[PDB]
């Protein structure tokens, strides 16, 4: 059965980290890691999950299982971070929240949702994006075609191009969008473009579907919502999968939602009945731990307040690096300025380099960045910073 | 887009769940429930298990994500289980082992991941079987057919039925087995039986797919495996599904392993990365804490000591449940044979009740069971079995 299987493609990701670990240099510098490292280089776990930790360790009593949508506080919780206290979407009962392993978890159940209970056949992605978008609405059997996103010459959102290239989306397509700090670009709609891009999806009949995985790492908890929130107030329905895997360090704990939003309670329930069967179809119900933690500290007022300062801490230490990174580089010698990294957003910017310097930083320099020329700036730390600038500006 | 879908079927089971809760009577008794209950009616957290997770909260300094195939020790430790230590499968480097969320999770890549790299159409379950089977293969895009299994007047493995049925399947199907502890019937293969099927098997050209949920119910960790043992001497290739969720009473921590074996570490090694391929696509890479648990008991000698007791200790009760109810259907008045309940194995039994008695056992009695007759021997207790057996003796 299995003798004639063709191997899974490379996976460039595991893959740059392989050839970091083997790599024997002083001082050699991963800008290519996915997650938060503080000023230590570490990516530790929050204090907030430690303690709550140690409160599910003394009270839990019993593991059996949660229902097929999680922890109902978690889903609460949920929609409150995402659509504001008071929305008008939770008052009338719109909405309903599977907790799911991981924010990729979710755009998966959105997906297998999709394809098994509607007409949608394709989903539309910026081009660049999160490299797995295609592999999960490929698995569940849905098309995913581009639109223009990044204007390379300026390094920002080529509006022009985005609304052009998603003139070609038909009815009852489905658009993806970040809903803040884009991966790879860190390059967000403003408010008024949000406003824009809601009114024209409504007008072209666009199912949106909103991918928010680093709510908190751009401006703020509730700014960052805002553009989804400008969404939320002019559709019947959407759809958003979000992640707790960056904004509480509960990357391995798989904690992530999948909200879905119809015209009324009565509509949004009956299409959740079929959310439900997608996720009893895949994994049955969700894990249990990382999720309790969100929901014990969210819901806690004394661990949301550390919380909330500790994500803070992080939003504002990228903030620190981005203006240490210009700084840095290019009052000391460079390229056609680099202050557009100062306006980005989150962990994430493409600097701009060929994927021939890229190869060339990782080969003579020891500084690994993935080919895109996308870096993570919390890889970066004062004491780093010096030999990586002097590295760029060696292969410029 | 969603104005037009569907409510899902029923759920009979959330379900039966929600009409017991709502019952005021006096002193109903819930036998539908698909988890272990002790002699006072709860679900704990293993001892074990609390140990270990104090361990990791006191031990663990980050979050950072898993490999998509998960713990490296959790897949060695799952493999031991599985094959025995010195197993031909594991010297070979045959096999291997991704984390999953749970046995079903574990069935769902297994499934998606045939579905997108062989020429597997079709999957064949015992007629009866866990109701969740369907669905995830149908999920999938596989065709489930059924294969007679149960032979309702000796209460017994029909095992003429079930080879007369089997010969409907071409080479190149799927044949799913549960590896002990059958559900619902826990009517189990001979180790003789197990050996015929797995010639059978190999003769027919069927891919077996072993469900192993319950590893440790029946008989204990070493002779529940006889009959996988049995089939992985024989075969070059299969699928094992395992599921920690009850032998470590980790329910809701999404706990289970999907193994796959070729003929050779190059076959597997090349089919394993379409796997992880399979689950990269799905919930990107899997939960920890739970696995972590697992993985921290197994390899330490004093915590494995510990945790197979407490399996040990399971496995007893249940025993004890079978024989006590038996002892007391006898002793109250039921005049008919019920030996068959001490010879079958796990937490389930059809009782050879009729869906009208079931029904009956619930409204006049307060006594839940599966519309099928199937009861869960652990919701017995010393103190409840009386009420219980009075009750059936009521309605036979
Ligand atoms: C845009 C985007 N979508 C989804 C994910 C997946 O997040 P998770 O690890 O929670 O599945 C990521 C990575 N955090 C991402 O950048
Ligand atoms: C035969 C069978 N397979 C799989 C499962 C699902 O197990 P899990 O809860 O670990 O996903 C069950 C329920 N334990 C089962 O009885």
Not at 271 to 282: D, E, G, L, T, Y
Not at 355 to 374: D, H, M, T, W
Request: net charge negative; aromatic share 10%.
């Amino acid at each position: 059965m299995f003798e004639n299987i063709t191997a899974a493609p490379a996976d460039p990701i595991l893959g740059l980290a392989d050839l970091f670990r083997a790599d024997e240099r002083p001082g050699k510098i991963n800008l290519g890691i996915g997650v938060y490292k503080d000023e230590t280089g570490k990516t530790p776990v929050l204090t907030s999950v430690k303690k709550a930790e140690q409160y599910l360790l003394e009270n839990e009593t019993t593991k059996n299982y949660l229902g097929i949508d999680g922890i109902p506080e978690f889903g609460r919780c949920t929609q409150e971070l995402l659509f504001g206290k008071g929305s008008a979407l939770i008052n009338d009962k719109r909405a309903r929240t599977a907790q799911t392993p991981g924010g990729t978890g979710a755009l998966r159940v959105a997906a297998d949702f999709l394809a098994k209970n509607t007409s949608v056949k394709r989903v539309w992605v910026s081009n660049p994006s999160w490299p797995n978008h295609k592999s999960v609405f490929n698995s569940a059997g849905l098309e995913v075609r581009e639109y223009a996103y990044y204007d390379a010459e300026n390094h920002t959102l080529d509006f022009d191009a985005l609304i052009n290239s998603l003139n070609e989306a038909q009815a009852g397509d489905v658009v993806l969008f970040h809903g803040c700090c884009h991966n790879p670009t860190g390059i967000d709609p403003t408010l008024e473009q949000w406003q824009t891009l809601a009114q024209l999806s409504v007008e072209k009949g666009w199912l949106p579907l909103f991918d928010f995985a680093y709510q908190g790492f751009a401006r703020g908890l509730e700014e960052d919502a805002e553009g989804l929130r400008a969404f939320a107030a002019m559709h019947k329905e959407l759809i958003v999968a979000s992640s707790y895997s960056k904004n509480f360090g509960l990357y391995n704990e798989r904690v992530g939602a999948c909200t879905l939003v119809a015209a009324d309670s009565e509509t949004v329930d009956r299409a959740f009945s079929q959310m439900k069967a997608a996720i009893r179809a895949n994994y049955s119900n969700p894990p249990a731990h990382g999720a309790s933690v969100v929901a014990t500290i969210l819901s806690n007022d004394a661990l949301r307040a550390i919380w909330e300062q500790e994500l803070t801490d992080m939003r504002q230490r990228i903030q620190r690096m981005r203006q240490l990174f210009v700084n840095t580089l290019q009052e000391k010698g460079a390229n056609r300025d680099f202050s557009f990294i100062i306006k980005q957003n989150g962990m994430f910017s493409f600097s701009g380099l060929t994927k021939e310097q890229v190869l060339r930083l990782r080969e003579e320099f020891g500084v690994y960045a993935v080919a895109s020329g996308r870096v993570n700036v919390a890889g970066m730390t004062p004491d780093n910073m010096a030999p990586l600038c002097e590295a760029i500006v060696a292969v410029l």
